[PDB]
Design a protein around this motif. Structure first.
Motif, PDB file in Angstrom:
ATOM      1  N   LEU A 181      -2.611   7.956   6.056  1.00  0.00           N
ATOM      2  CA  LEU A 181      -1.836   8.551   4.970  1.00  0.00           C
ATOM      3  C   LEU A 181      -2.535   9.812   4.453  1.00  0.00           C
ATOM      4  O   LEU A 181      -1.850  10.823   4.180  1.00  0.00           O
ATOM      5  N   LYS A 211      -6.027  -1.753   6.185  1.00  0.00           N
ATOM      6  CA  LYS A 211      -5.657  -0.928   5.061  1.00  0.00           C
ATOM      7  C   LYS A 211      -6.513   0.323   4.926  1.00  0.00           C
ATOM      8  O   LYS A 211      -6.014   1.295   4.484  1.00  0.00           O
ATOM      9  N   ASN A 267      -5.048   2.599   7.519  1.00  0.00           N
ATOM     10  CA  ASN A 267      -3.778   3.049   7.004  1.00  0.00           C
ATOM     11  C   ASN A 267      -3.962   4.168   5.955  1.00  0.00           C
ATOM     12  O   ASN A 267      -3.277   5.220   6.024  1.00  0.00           O
ATOM     13  N   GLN A 268      -4.929   3.977   5.078  1.00  0.00           N
ATOM     14  CA  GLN A 268      -5.160   4.992   4.046  1.00  0.00           C
ATOM     15  C   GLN A 268      -5.632   6.319   4.709  1.00  0.00           C
ATOM     16  O   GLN A 268      -5.292   7.407   4.249  1.00  0.00           O
ATOM     17  N   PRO A 295       5.240   8.597   3.445  1.00  0.00           N
ATOM     18  CA  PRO A 295       5.756   9.044   4.748  1.00  0.00           C
ATOM     19  C   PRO A 295       6.269   7.894   5.601  1.00  0.00           C
ATOM     20  O   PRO A 295       7.122   8.141   6.441  1.00  0.00           O
ATOM     21  N   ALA A 344       5.093  10.843  -1.918  1.00  0.00           N
ATOM     22  CA  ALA A 344       4.253  10.945  -0.707  1.00  0.00           C
ATOM     23  C   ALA A 344       4.208   9.598   0.023  1.00  0.00           C
ATOM     24  O   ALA A 344       3.143   9.015   0.229  1.00  0.00           O
ATOM     25  N   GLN A 359       0.832  -1.189   0.000  1.00  0.00           N
ATOM     26  CA  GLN A 359       0.000   0.000   0.000  1.00  0.00           C
ATOM     27  C   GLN A 359       0.865   1.237   0.000  1.00  0.00           C
ATOM     28  O   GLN A 359       1.713   1.380   0.864  1.00  0.00           O
ATOM     29  N   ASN A 360       0.666   2.109  -1.005  1.00  0.00           N
ATOM     30  CA  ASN A 360       1.385   3.375  -1.134  1.00  0.00           C
ATOM     31  C   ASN A 360       2.891   3.143  -1.274  1.00  0.00           C
ATOM     32  O   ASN A 360       3.689   3.926  -0.777  1.00  0.00           O
ATOM     33  N   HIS A 413      -1.858  12.499   7.054  1.00  0.00           N
ATOM     34  CA  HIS A 413      -0.497  12.938   6.866  1.00  0.00           C
ATOM     35  C   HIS A 413      -0.320  13.904   5.688  1.00  0.00           C
ATOM     36  O   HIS A 413       0.401  14.897   5.807  1.00  0.00           O
TER      37      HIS A 413
END
Ligand SMILES: [Cl-]
Ligand SMILES: [Cl-]
Ligand SMILES: [Cl-]
Ligand SMILES: [Cl-]
Ligand SMILES: [Cl-]
Ligand SMILES: [Cl-]
Ligand SMILES: [Cl-]
Ligand SMILES: [Cl-]
Ligand SMILES: [Cl-]
Ligand SMILES: [Cl-]
Ligand SMILES: [Cl-]
Ligand SMILES: [Cl-]
Ligand SMILES: [Cl-]
Ligand SMILES: [Cl-]
Ligand SMILES: [Pt+2]
Ligand SMILES: [Pt+2]
Ligand SMILES: [Pt+2]
Ligand SMILES: [Pt+2]
Ligand SMILES: [Pt+2]
Ligand SMILES: [Pt+2]
Ligand SMILES: [Pt+2]
Ligand SMILES: [Pt+2]
Ligand SMILES: [Pt+2]
Ligand SMILES: [Pt+2]
Ligand SMILES: [Pt+2]
Ligand SMILES: [Pt+2]
Lengths: 173, 173, 173, 173, 173, 173
Positions: free
Chosen positions: D111, D104, D107-108, B123, B121, B6-7, D114
């Protein structure tokens, strides 16, 4: 004015505030000396620790004077703190010379204030100074003179090598 | 493909694998530096221990990057490890210069990867690097600069004697 | 040349450097095996730990050879380290087969170097190998053969379930 | 309004309150998951303990966000907590899939917040999230992916037996 | 110039020196606040201890910035330290207001320096500030706001009595 | 359906699920009460701790009911959790009044469920409630009434000062 104040002249009160300023200025000087010797291009850890320890001692001196000012019913007055006399302090020898000059100026200010207390018949002030400051300064100045002599002896021989050895074998790290 | 990923950009994934290669190459360089200083004809035990310790640190760095790669759902890919740049490393001064050059190249690779995470992006990547790598490198580079300065000061004086003294009184044995 | 070197042939010296390369290559292979089994999509922690432990053992082997090279007055020479033979290592069974192949190649290199020391009448080399390497390899190869047999027995039965059970009840986690 | 509030946007303040709601909703989901696996007709104690532990972690997450909201001078606002998405959660495999989807989404949201702090130049918020949330989530998601893989491997083999074994030999009881 | 300096702008170097000056000025302010509350005619020991503790914290802040300056290869430059803004600090309420104003000015200087590091792509600086300064300030400002509220609540009621109670039951003595 | 279920009515099963919802709603209310008293502009730490402790107690209550539901072969069903009745809770006195209202509603729900168990001749349910809930509630309500009386006595006198004193000398911090 003060309910506690007794036998405490305005002359002594003012001189105590000036002495606080001198001790804080000395503390600041030793902060700059310590960090100079922590530079990557100077890198004498034992020298940095010696001067940082002295920065602490001088601040403690000031705090002890401020405590006493309040105990006698005087009023603490703070002034600007002048920056140290140099931005870069040269060799361990140059630094230790600058430190001894500084200590002797503090010592003379102590002796001046003692003479003032004696002229004002202020025996608490005289004992305060004798008990917490005059012997400490004499001991420190002697230690700095001892250091001077050893640095001189070492760097007359071979300057870089001598400075290293002093830092490693005399100073604490 | 990855159930956890993820990301996490393919750009970062690839750069993490390159960084692992750089840390392992650095480890290998420090293995060769350490054993060079263990030769009977060089015989500077404290220098050998300093560089062997660094070989361990760099391998730990790599392992920490590999752990993170897997935590993010990337795939570790290993490449050939190029041999160190020299077979013989000269004096303690030459060696410590080579080490600081090496560390600054690692540091620049860290900063490059950080800039990449910031552009993507990402982090978690930025924090991972800040927390485990950027401060450690800055501290190490400073320590190496301190060492440089002390070696220089000593070997300008008298080269053999200076090198001996540094090893005995600064380095751990 | 070397003040200490005695009864140490250039043939042995070169073969010791090649053996160091082989042990470091083996270490690297086990680093890649360990992290493969740490992938989220493989996730066999006990397998990862087994191969990481072996990566450490092989690096220790190399370091022990480098120490000896220096003790005998030879000169350590490092070469590029070839990447592992695979990027993905299949099942626990495929991995353990690859590991035993690898160990037997190390073992054969040990036996070759022993034969070389014997032909050169180098009894320190022969004892060094006997004392620190030949028995360790025989013991490891036996352990890997034991593991092979148990994995085979388990995965002939039911492949996924068998692999899980081996990791949980034989390997350390 | 707030005597302490500095560099704290209303956008971040509101998003922090939404994140608190999401963490409490996640806590509630894990409460329902845990008790489902405690049913007499499901009876997987290690699975129940794993999800109850997660219910605690998510509530701690929320409390940590609420503490921070107050430290920054924002105002905590609570909303209704939506019930979990299911009343019955199927097999250990279905449950662990639902858990990873949930993580997830958290988590998103982390993010996203952030990115919002970065756009608002709110470096305290960014550090708060990096330090207490982003790494924890990455580690948890990896652990859940590891679990997924092991459950899948086991239940492809023989579903009932596999689920039992996972609970007994991987999960804590 | 510096053998270690890497990715460290002259802009950041100068701003670090200004920040050191601000932290030392804050330390000095807290020294004067502490001793004011030690006067026989103010006599709030817990208030004196609170501000003396803060004087120590701010000096530690400065020392931590000076250490970092040297680690990055910048050069510490010291300037005059301006005296505190007042000679007498009024009530516990006036003092705590002055303290929070002071902390918010430090905080803004931290945030400014962070924005500067971010514009210069200096992630070591950003992490240094996040790790050692931004959270500490937020926590302190919150604590001071809590104190404010409690003092206000107490001295709205009955001023002398309230101030006494705060000092005795909230502050450490 | 349930292999274990014996003498457990669908009426009790449903009422147990409603009671779980009420205890979780109460927990949530106490979470909001606790954090309200942690605001910088309210700042009554002992009040925050008292209500956070109660949030924990109510969640434990719910978990104990869910455990029992499963022990009896009922099926836990979760519903939306309504947000607390207020966003801001006024003074310590307003808060403690709201808390006692809340506890009495829980208590009445306990007494209702007890009457239902008695009508259904379900003596396990009646003992469960008597043993773990009815005495705990009576004790808590008494404690809250004691607190009420003391707050009232204090804030009739002088509101701000009284609230401070209660928090400092009655509540735990
Ligand atoms: Cl002292
Ligand atoms: Cl000046
Ligand atoms: Cl005398
Ligand atoms: Cl480490
Ligand atoms: Cl090459
Ligand atoms: Cl071993
Ligand atoms: Cl190859
Ligand atoms: Cl936690
Ligand atoms: Cl819903
Ligand atoms: Cl950050
Ligand atoms: Cl501190
Ligand atoms: Cl001024
Ligand atoms: Cl309890
Ligand atoms: Cl509602
Ligand atoms: Pt005395
Ligand atoms: Pt030190
Ligand atoms: Pt981390
Ligand atoms: Pt040694
Ligand atoms: Pt041996
Ligand atoms: Pt492990
Ligand atoms: Pt933090
Ligand atoms: Pt249990
Ligand atoms: Pt740091
Ligand atoms: Pt005291
Ligand atoms: Pt019971
Ligand atoms: Pt507390």
């Amino acid at each position: 004015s003060s309910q506690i104040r007794q036998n405490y002249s305005t002359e002594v009160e003012a001189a105590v505030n000036r002495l606080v300023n001198l001790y804080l200025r000395a503390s600041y000087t030793y902060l700059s000396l310590g960090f100079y010797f922590d530079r990557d291009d100077v890198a004498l850890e034992g020298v940095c620790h010696f001067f940082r320890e002295l920065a602490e001692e001088k601040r403690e001196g000031a705090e002890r004077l401020l405590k006493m000012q309040n105990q006698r019913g005087g009023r603490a007055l703070f002034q600007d703190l002048q920056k140290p006399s140099q931005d870069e302090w040269g060799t361990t020898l140059d630094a230790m010379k600058a430190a001894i000059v500084l200590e002797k100026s503090l010592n003379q200010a102590l002796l001046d204030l003692h003479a003032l207390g004696s002229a004002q018949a202020d025996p608490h002030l005289c004992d305060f100074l004798e008990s917490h400051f005059l012997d400490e300064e004499v001991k420190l100045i002697k230690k700095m003179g001892d250091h001077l002599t050893n640095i001189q002896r070492l760097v007359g021989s071979q300057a870089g090598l001598g400075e290293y050895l002093f830092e490693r074998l005399t100073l604490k790290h």
